């Protein structure tokens, strides 16, 4: 049976001047931008590395255009350390998303700056 | 004992071209922009009017700079129809925020475009 | 646009003889009774100051007559440190309510003695 | 091995004059008062029969004196139709409790009038 | 009014070779097997004694044949330390169940080996 | 940067003789057994196709040996329609797991029969 591709990205969050900074690293330890191109059906797994001491946990992934069909689903682990995107790469196009996190310092949700997914179907 | 001001804003969400559009109205029924100036301690109450048929519910209010002290706390009702901001208007400045909503069509979170709160202390 | 009033009350909880005692203070640090009169639309914000060492968190606000229309809605923060009442002060009358809290010592919910809200519309 | 007693009570909730009325029935279909005497270790199982059309669900059982040791624990089913009290009947005395329920009409919690448990150890 | 029987079982969980082992004890401190015979309507209360240092909490009780009517309901305490089974012992027969637990080491659920309930109605 | 493999399995659940039957299908529509061999780091995505009319939702994936390191993490979607396993395929060996589901007919959790994951590292 046909398999897709599984991509793995670490979401490192530090504090600079009291506020969160999101640094993505790839499987080689290379800093990468937030943008991903998807060229076949698959998954994108984001692992949280919270270095802020603010108790960050993923609560989901947010979209300004959530019905565009670029990302099919979001799954989250019980400890808020992992989020995964399912992308069946049927609908071509681009979508902008932001990570949504809770914190233990206050009751405000934390948003990352926007990142982009580009689908190029097969 | 000293009282603050309570502001009330309706968050009307429609669909245009399949995607959500956020229209804020004030207590007079006037369309207003998302930006609010806070000139003393108080609360801002947002009531969801979901006209999308996508089962939107508030899940919180998100901030790219959540530790800036502009908004002190966020409260949410059990049905996801109300969110309230507490703003003690001690720390002057401006912060950008986006509403975060769940939907019943898919498992992606919905984000509004950004809005601004400006604190001018007394 | 028309604004309402935002009232702020601290809910101090101590232990006397092993059991919780609720002491309300107002914005001046004055001990006040639990009763509030509402004379226009607005909000009431309750901040938990738990001095019990029993891990108290708000889980809601309870009413024996919940459909009386005196309080329109209750919102709660994610950390259980704040609850807010929305009172549009359209329907005149009085309602009795009790704070509902979880604790970390056991699986029983904690109730405050009853307090009253009196609505006097404009 | 030693067994305790399991008591079963139906919590019938109707609306009279728009507001909830709690009617307890016992295993014979007899209306009973809310008060129970516990004369050995055991459980009390409360089954919700909501006749209000307000979508009531148990969310817990509340106590003004939650650390008195009369009731050891509360368990709740996932559908909010059952709550159970564990009473090891070690500590003698009496405690007053109220059922705490959510509803689908508004975001206020619903409280029953108080009921009493009397422990008489063996 | 007619009463049933309340049974009490402690679910002791240790680690052997890095993995959980479930040891049931009865009200006398005797190790018992997981199997219970129910000969009249009643409850079975399971208390978690987690000796693993893996932060185990009950999240429910699972069944391969959940619609067989042997167990009528499951209730759980807010701290995940207690689960209770309601067994009205109307439908005779046997059912196999496993405890379902969360842990704080990872995001996998923990299952006990299967145990059996045998109903013998009156 | 290095990518893994993403596998996709549909979890079809029917009722036979009143009880759930789990039928797995692969990306070709072929019925497959529950067992999967993992030969490099990647993800396994399970999509629920509930044909039971019992309101099944995934609540997690359970393991009798949850600390064996075969599966690194489980993620779940907000609607309970998807669960995903992360398998970094570092630790070789085999583990047995069961799907854990809630239902809307009763408060018992639903377990699948066991399935196996076999890790063969690279």
Q: What is the Cα–Cα distance from C101 to A105, expressed in whole angstroms?
A: 21
- List of chains touching F (3+ CB pairs within 8 A): A, B, D, E
Nearest CA in chain A to E105: A79
Q: What is the Cα–Cα distance from A71 to A60, expressed in whole angstroms?
A: 13
B107 lies within 8 A of chain F by CB? yes
DSSP for B40-55 reads SSEEEEEEEEE-SSS-
Do E and B touch, counting CB pairs below 8 Å (3 needed)? no
Contact residues on chain B for D60, CB-CB shorter than 8 A: none
How was this structure determined? It was done by X-ray
Contact residues on chain C for B30, CB-CB shorter than 8 A: 1
Q: What is the Cα–Cα distance from F44 to F6, expressed in whole angstroms?
A: 6
Q: What is the Cα–Cα distance from D120 to D104, expressed in whole angstroms?
A: 39
B103 to each of A93, B1, B108, B109, D71, how far by Cα in Å?
Answer: 22, 41, 7, 7, 40
Query: B103: Cβ–Cβ under 8 A, 6 or more apart, which residues?
Result: A66, B52, B54, B55, B56, B57, B109, B110
The answer to whether the beta carbons of residues D69 and D38 sit under 8 Å apart is no
- Note whether E109 contacts F20, CB cutoff 8 Å: no
Write down the residue that tokens 């995607």 correspond to: B19
Structure tokens at F4: 């893994």
Antiparallel, parallel or unpaired: β F115-119 and F93-102: antiparallel
The answer to whether the beta carbons of residues A74 and A117 sit under 8 Å apart is no
Q: Residue F38's closest CA among F13, F10, F2, F6? A: F6
Of D65, D73, D100, the CB nearest to C100: D100
Contact residues on chain F for E18, CB-CB shorter than 8 A: 67-68
Q: What is the Cα–Cα distance from A43 to A54, expressed in whole angstroms?
A: 28
Burial category of D33 from C-beta neighbours within 10 Å (exposed 0-12, middle 13-18, buried 19 and up): exposed
Nearest CA in chain F to D81: F107
Nearest CA in chain D to C75: D107
Q: What is the Cα–Cα distance from F9 to F2, expressed in whole angstroms?
A: 23
- List of chains touching B (3+ CB pairs within 8 A): A, C, D, F
- Note whether D76 contacts E78, CB cutoff 8 Å: yes
HSE-up (13 A, CA, CB side) for residue D64: 17
CA end-to-end distance (rounded Å), chain A: 17
Q: How many CB atoms lie within 10 A of CB C48?
A: 19
Please state the φ and ψ torsions of residue D98, each to the nearest 5 degrees.
-135, 135
Q: What is the Cα–Cα distance from D20 to F87, expressed in whole angstroms?
A: 52
Beta pairing partners, D47: D10, D82
Nearest CA in chain E to C107: E78
Q: What is the Cα–Cα distance from F66 to F41, expressed in whole angstroms?
A: 18
Structure tokens at C65: 């007559």
Q: What is the Cα–Cα distance from D51 to D54, expressed in whole angstroms?
A: 8
- Note whether B102 contacts F77, CB cutoff 8 Å: no
Q: What is the Cα–Cα distance from B61 to B97, expressed in whole angstroms?
A: 7
Q: What is the Cα–Cα distance from F11 to F22, expressed in whole angstroms?
A: 7
The answer to whether the beta carbons of residues A19 and B68 sit under 8 Å apart is yes
- Note whether A100 contacts B107, CB cutoff 8 Å: no
Torsion on CA atoms D84, D88, D90, D92, rounded to nearest 10? 30
Nearest CA in chain F to D78: F107
Q: Residue A68's closest CA among A6, A19, A7, A119? A: A119
D86 lies within 8 A of chain E by CB? yes
DSSP collapsed to 3 states, chain A: CCCEEEEEEEEEEEEECCEEEEEEECCCCCEECCCEEECCCEEEEEEEEECCCCCCEEEEEEECCCCCCCCCEEEEECCCCEEEEEECCCCCEEEEEEEEEECCCCCCEEECCCEEEEECCC
Contact residues on chain D for C112, CB-CB shorter than 8 A: 64
Q: What is the Cα–Cα distance from F110 to E97, expressed in whole angstroms?
A: 9
Residues annotated in a binding site of D for Zn(2+)? 69, 72, 89, 91
Residues annotated in a binding site of D? 15-16, 69-70, 72, 87, 89, 91
Burial category of C33 from C-beta neighbours within 10 Å (exposed 0-12, middle 13-18, buried 19 and up): exposed
C8 lies within 8 A of chain B by CB? yes
E78 lies within 8 A of chain C by CB? yes
A82 lies within 8 A of chain E by CB? yes
Q: What is the Cα–Cα distance from B31 to B24, expressed in whole angstroms?
A: 6
State the smallest CA–CA distance between residue A80 and chain F in angstroms. 9
The answer to whether the beta carbons of residues F95 and F85 sit under 8 Å apart is no
Resolution in A: 1.6
Q: What is the Cα–Cα distance from E7 to D120, expressed in whole angstroms?
A: 19
Contact residues on chain B for D102, CB-CB shorter than 8 A: 78
Q: What is the Cα–Cα distance from D86 to D79, expressed in whole angstroms?
A: 19
What number of residues does chain F have?
122
- List of chains touching D (3+ CB pairs within 8 A): B, C, E, F
Q: What is the Cα–Cα distance from D101 to D57, expressed in whole angstroms?
A: 5
Antiparallel, parallel or unpaired: β E115-119 and E36-38: parallel
Of F30, F42, F82, the CB nearest to A6: F42
Please state the φ and ψ torsions of residue B97, each to the nearest 5 degrees.
-140, 160
The answer to whether the beta carbons of residues E101 and E61 sit under 8 Å apart is no
Structure tokens at D73: 């624990």
Q: What is the Cα–Cα distance from C110 to E14, expressed in whole angstroms?
A: 33
Nearest CA in chain E to F85: E108
E88 to each of B9, B12, E24, E31, F109, how far by Cα in Å?
Answer: 52, 49, 23, 26, 18
- Note whether A60 contacts B100, CB cutoff 8 Å: yes
Return the DSSP state at C114: P
Q: Residue A48's closest CA among A40, A39, A57? A: A57
Tell me the Cα Rg of chain B: 14
CA end-to-end distance (rounded Å), chain D: 17
Q: What is the Cα–Cα distance from F68 to F91, expressed in whole angstroms?
A: 8
Question: What is the Cα F84 distance to its own chain's centre?
Answer: 7
Antiparallel, parallel or unpaired: β A82-87 and C36-38: unpaired
Q: Residue C116's closest CA among C45, C39, C38? A: C38
Please state the φ and ψ torsions of residue B63, each to the nearest 5 degrees.
-135, 135
Q: What is the Cα–Cα distance from A92 to E66, expressed in whole angstroms?
A: 43
D73 lies within 8 A of chain E by CB? yes
Q: Which domains does chain F have, with CATH numbers?
A: 1-122 (2.60.40.420)
Nearest CA in chain C to D114: C64
State the smallest CA–CA distance between residue E79 and chain D in angstroms. 9
Burial category of B11 from C-beta neighbours within 10 Å (exposed 0-12, middle 13-18, buried 19 and up): buried
Q: What is the Cα–Cα distance from C98 to C34, expressed in whole angstroms?
A: 10
F29 lies within 8 A of chain A by CB? no
Q: What is the Cα–Cα distance from F66 to F63, expressed in whole angstroms?
A: 5
Query: C76: Cβ–Cβ under 8 A, 6 or more apart, which residues?
Result: B75, B76, B77, B78, C58, C59, C60, C82, C83, C84
The answer to whether the beta carbons of residues C90 and C79 sit under 8 Å apart is no
Write down the residue that tokens 């640094």 correspond to: A23
Q: What is the Cα–Cα distance from B43 to C78, expressed in whole angstroms?
A: 17
State the smallest CA–CA distance between residue E107 and chain A in angstroms. 6
C52 to each of C30, C32, C105, C115, how far by Cα in Å?
Answer: 20, 20, 11, 21
Q: Tell me which H or E stretch contains C121.
A: none
């Amino acid at each position: 049976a046909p398999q897709g591709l599984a991509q793995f990205i670490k979401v490192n969050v530090t504090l600079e001047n009291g506020e969160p900074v999101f640094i993505y690293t790839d499987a080689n330890g290379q800093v990468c931008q937030g943008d991903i191109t998807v060229t076949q059906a698959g998954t994108i797994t984001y692992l949280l590395n919270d270095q802020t001491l603010k108790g960050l946990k993923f609560v989901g992934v947010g979209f300004v255009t959530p019905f565009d069909g670029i990302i099919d689903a979001v799954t989250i682990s019980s400890d808020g350390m992992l989020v995964q995107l399912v992308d069946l790469d049927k609908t071509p196009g681009t979508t902008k998303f932001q990570f949504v996190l809770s914190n233990t310092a206050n009751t405000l949700l934390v948003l990352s700056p926007d990142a982009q997914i580009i689908n190029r179907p097969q």
